[PDB]
Amino acid sequence: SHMWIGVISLFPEMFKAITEFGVTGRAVKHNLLKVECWNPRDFTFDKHKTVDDRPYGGGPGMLMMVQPLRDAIHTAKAAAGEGAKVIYLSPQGRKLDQGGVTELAQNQKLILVCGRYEGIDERLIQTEIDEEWSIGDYVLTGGELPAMTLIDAVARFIPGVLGDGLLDCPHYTRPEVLEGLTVPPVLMSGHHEEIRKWRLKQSLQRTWLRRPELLEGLALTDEQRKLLKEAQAEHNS
């Protein structure tokens, strides 16, 4: 099953970062992921191709001009056909987490609207946007990096693109000793079950130490409860 993502952006060439490189680049080349861009600048009619406009009420910044942006959105919606969810990315949106990625990955078509300047007219959010999403509680110069982050995250769910609430365990590769630090012997034991339990215990320990609030949201298995208790006992010596 493939995924189609329409993007509205003043800087469509930024999207080469995901369409030309790495796992996502392969997904695009293999037609597993399609990314199509529309630029509001192409929908302007004045000589200077104006894409910003002044905010009612004054203020230091500018907003995206409504007409070119609205026309670009409508063109993207026509290209998508029916069933495409239109998303605006901003810090005022629902904060993205891996559960939200999983939800968004259920869509076969998405349209991502990338804001620049101080943002977009509130009435376009009311009339054109289905959902507002944020990649995190911080402020950027534009919505393109958030859009690409979202695309990369959801692309991992497309069948063929790739070859539990806890933080990842530590990983080791060659050499066996690096600046005096050795690989945990269990990882060289060849005992698959002991290795699985070590990695799970490490993930539980790391989540407890670094992000204890994430543990509150989990219903730990019996095995996970035991390994977490073991890790906490070792921490308390």
Ligand X SMILES: CC(C)(C)CNc1ncc(C(N)=O)c(N)n1
- Give me the residues that bind ligand X (CB under 6 A), please: 89-91, 115-116, 119, 134-136, 138-140, 142-143, 146
Residue 143 binds which of its own copies, ligand X, none (CB < 5-8 A, kind-dependent):
ligand X
158 touches its own copies (CB under 8 A): no
**Cα torsion 212, 213, 216, 222: sign:** negative
90 touches its own copies (CB under 8 A): yes
The candidate with the shortest Cα–Cα distance to 26, out of 199, 132, 161, is: 161
* Residue burial 34-73, b: 16+ Cβ < 10 Å; e: rest: ebebbbbeebbeeeeeebebeeeeeeeeebbbeebbbbbb
Distance of closest approach, residue 66 Cβ to its own copies, in angstroms:
6
**Is 129 annotated as ligand-binding?**
no
Single residue of 31, 173, 236, 237 touching its own copies by CB under 8 A: 173
217 touches its own copies (CB under 8 A): no
120 touches its own copies (CB under 8 A): yes
Rounded CA gap, 68 and 45, in Å?
Answer: 9
**Is 172 annotated as ligand-binding?**
no
16 touches its own copies (CB under 8 A): yes
DSSP 88-102: EEEEEEEEP-HHHHH
Q: Specify the residue, 40 or 143, whose C-beta has the smaller distance to ligand X.
A: 143
Binding residues for S-adenosyl-L-methionine: 88, 115, 135-140
